[PDB]
Amino acid sequence: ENRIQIMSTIAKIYRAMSRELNRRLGELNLSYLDFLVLRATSDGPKTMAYLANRYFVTQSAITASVDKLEEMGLVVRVRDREDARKILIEITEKGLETFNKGIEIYKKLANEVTGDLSEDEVILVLDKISKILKRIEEISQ
Amino acid sequence: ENRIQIMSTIAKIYRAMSRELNRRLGELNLSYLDFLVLRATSDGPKTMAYLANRYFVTQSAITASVDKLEEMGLVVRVRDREDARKILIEITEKGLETFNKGIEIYKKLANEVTGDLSEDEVILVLDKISKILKRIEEISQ
Ligand SMILES: [Ca+2]
Numbered sequence: 707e708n709r710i711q712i713m714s715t716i717a718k719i720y721r722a723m724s725r726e727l728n729r730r731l732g733e734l735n736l737s738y739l740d741f742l743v744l745r746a747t748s749d750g751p752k753t754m755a756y757l758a759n760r761y762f763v764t765q766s767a768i769t770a771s772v773d774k775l776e777e778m779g780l781v782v783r784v785r786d787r788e789d790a791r792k793i794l795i796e797i798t799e800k801g802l803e804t805f806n807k808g809i810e811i812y813k814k815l816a817n818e819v820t821g822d823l824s825e826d827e828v829i830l831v832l833d834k835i836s837k838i839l840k841r842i843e844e845i846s847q
Numbered sequence: 848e849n850r851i852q853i854m855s856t857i858a859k860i861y862r863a864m865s866r867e868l869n870r871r872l873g874e875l876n877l878s879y880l881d882f883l884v885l886r887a888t889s890d891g892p893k894t895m896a897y898l899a900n901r902y903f904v905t906q907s908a909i910t911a912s913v914d915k916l917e918e919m920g921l922v923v924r925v926r927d928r929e930d931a932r933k934i935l936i937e938i939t940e941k942g943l944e945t946f947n948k949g950i951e952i953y954k955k956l957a958n959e960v961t962g963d964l965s966e967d968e969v970i971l972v973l974d975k976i977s978k979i980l981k982r983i984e985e986i987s988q
């Protein structure tokens with residue numbers, strides 16, 4: 707039926723986008739996950755637990771991504787003033803710079819794949835799928 | 848901007864759906880990937896290379912899924928009459944039965960998350976995102 711197709715098409719779009727993003731982001735020395743980590747911390751420090759849960763990826767995958775971004779000087783680990791085991795991943799200036807370059811790449815690709823759509827259509831679709839997301843997130847967790 | 852949000856919302860929807868599907872499919876003794884393997888072979892035998900490429904997953908992940916489904920008696924390996932290394936993964940009757948049960952679960956979830964939408968809206972959104980998919984697939988590969 708149609709409702710099945712909306713969800714399955716969403717999935718196919720995600721897989722194709724994730725693959726192309728991985729390729730285009732490679733030139734900034736980042737994978738799609740590394741970019742997601744930068745996007746998440748671009749607006750504030752994030753715990754590694756949050757990162758793994760928000761983007762549905764193993765904790766070991768987050769550890770690998772953060773270790774990498776840290777070596778690249780794009781994020782830093784900030785330990786609580788009194789506690790030490792409590793860690794927050796904060797983005798750096800260089801990281802924000804790289805993130806912004808990542809956003810342009812994402813924006814460029816988003817403009818292409820949605821080219822057959824007009825502003826009205828884009829807004830119409832966005833409004834409607836935002837409802838779908840609200841529902842699945844209320845269900846999923 | 849809006850075009851960015853369409854793609855990012857698509858991704859968030861995918862992650863939330865994949866997580867809930869994994870949970871609901873667990874009762875049929877399948878993960879989301881195993882279900883994808885059954886969906887792919889439900890209409891005809893598929894090579895393992897195709898499976899890994901179509902659903903963007905490592906070959907080792909496909910091997911693990913197929914080994915599993917085979918032990919569960921849901922798929923079989925069919926070797927060419929003359930060649931032996933050439934393998935096709937064919938679904939079994941039990942596999943089709945299990946697949947169909949999987950489809951009902953997917954259908955049930957799809958109906959819920961898209962509840963705020965009407966038939967017209969569903970068709971309208973489907974038509975439009977199918978264009979997005981056509982474009983990304985032409986770009987991605
Ligand atoms: Ca809930």
Ligand SMILES: [Ca+2]
Pocket residue numbers: 985986987988
């Ligand atoms: Ca091409």
